[PDB]
Amino acid sequence: QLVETGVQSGGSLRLSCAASGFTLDNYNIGWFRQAPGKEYGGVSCISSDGSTYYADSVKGRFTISRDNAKNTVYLQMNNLKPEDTDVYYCAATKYGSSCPIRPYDYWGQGTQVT
Amino acid sequence: QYPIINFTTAGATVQSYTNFIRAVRGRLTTGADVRHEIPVLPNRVGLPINQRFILVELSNHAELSVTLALDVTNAYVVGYRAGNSAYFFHPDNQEDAEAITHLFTDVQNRYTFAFGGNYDRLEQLAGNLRENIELGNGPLEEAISALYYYSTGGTQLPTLARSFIICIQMISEAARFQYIEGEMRTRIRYNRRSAPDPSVITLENSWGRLSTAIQESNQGAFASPIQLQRRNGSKFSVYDVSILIPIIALMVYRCAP
Ligand SMILES: [Cl-]
Ligand SMILES: [Zn+2]
Which B residues, 197 through 256, put their C-beta within 8 Å of a C-beta on chain A?
207-209, 211-212, 216, 224, 252, 254-255
Per-residue burial over B118-154, b if 16 or more Cβ lie within 10 Å, else e, is bbbbbbebbebebeebbbbbebbbbbbbbbbbbbeee
| Chain B CB within 8 Å of residue A44 CB | no
- Cα end-to-end distance, chain B, whole Å: 32
- The residue of chain B nearest to residue A99, with distances taken between CA atoms, is B93
Q: How many whole angstroms separate alpha carbon B36 and alpha carbon B246? A: 11
Short-list A82, A60, A88, A76, CA closest to A9: A82
Residue B34 near residue B25, CB atoms below 8 Å: no
- Chain A CB contacts of B123 under 8 Å are none
Distance B4 CA to ligand 1 centre (A): 19
Strand pairing of A13-19 and A72-77?
A: antiparallel
In chain A the first and final C-alpha atoms are separated, in Å, by 25
Closest CA to B249 of B201, B214, B197, B198: B214
Residues 6+ apart with CB under 8 A from B15: none
Q: How far, in Å, CA of A108 to CA of B221, rounded?
A: 27
Encoded amino acid at A24, one letter: L
State the catalytic residues of B: 76, 119, 173, 176
Judge whether A24 is closer than 8 Å to chain B, CB to CB.
no
Is there a contact between B55 and B67 (Cβ–Cβ < 8 Å)? yes
HSE-CB for A42 with a 13 A CA cutoff: 28
d(CA B151, CA A50): 46
Residue A96 with chain B: CB contacts under 8 Å = 254
Resolution of this model in Å is: 2.1
Reported in sequence order, the residue ranges of chain B that DSSP labels E, i.e. its strands, are: 4-8, 34-35, 38-39, 53-59, 65-71, 77-82, 85-88, 109-112, 221-229, 235-240
The ligand with the least distance to the CA atom of B99 is 2
The alpha carbon of B109 and the centre of ligand 1 are apart by a number of angstroms equal to 10
Residue of B251, B239, B165, B255 whose CA lies nearest to B206: B251
Q: Under a CB-based contact definition with an 8 Å cutoff, are residues A40 and A34 in contact?
A: no
Beta bridge partners of B40: B251
- Residues 6 or more apart whose CB falls under 8 angstroms from that of A15 comprise A4, A5, A6, A31, A74, A75, A77, A88, A111, A113
Elucidation method: X-ray
CB contact at 8 A, B247 and B211: no
* Four-residue CA torsion sign, B15, B17, B21, B26: positive
A108 in Cβ contact with A91 (< 8 Å): yes
Neighbour-count burial of B107, counting CB atoms closer than 10 A to its CB (0-12 exposed, 13-18 middle, 19+ buried): middle
Domains of chain B and CATH, by start: 1-175 (3.40.420.10), 176-257 (4.10.470.10)
Instruction: Give the span between the Cα atoms of B171 and A27, in whole angstroms.
Output: 30
Residue A52 and residue A46 in contact, taking contact as beta carbons nearer than 8 Å:
yes
Q: What is the rounded CA–CA span in Å between residue B46 and residue B56?
A: 24
Breaks in chain A after (C-N > 2.5 angstroms): 6, 48
Q: Are A95 and B96 a contacting pair at CB < 8 A? A: no
Contact call for B93 and A37, based on CB within 8 A:
no
CB contact under 8 A, A35 and B115: yes
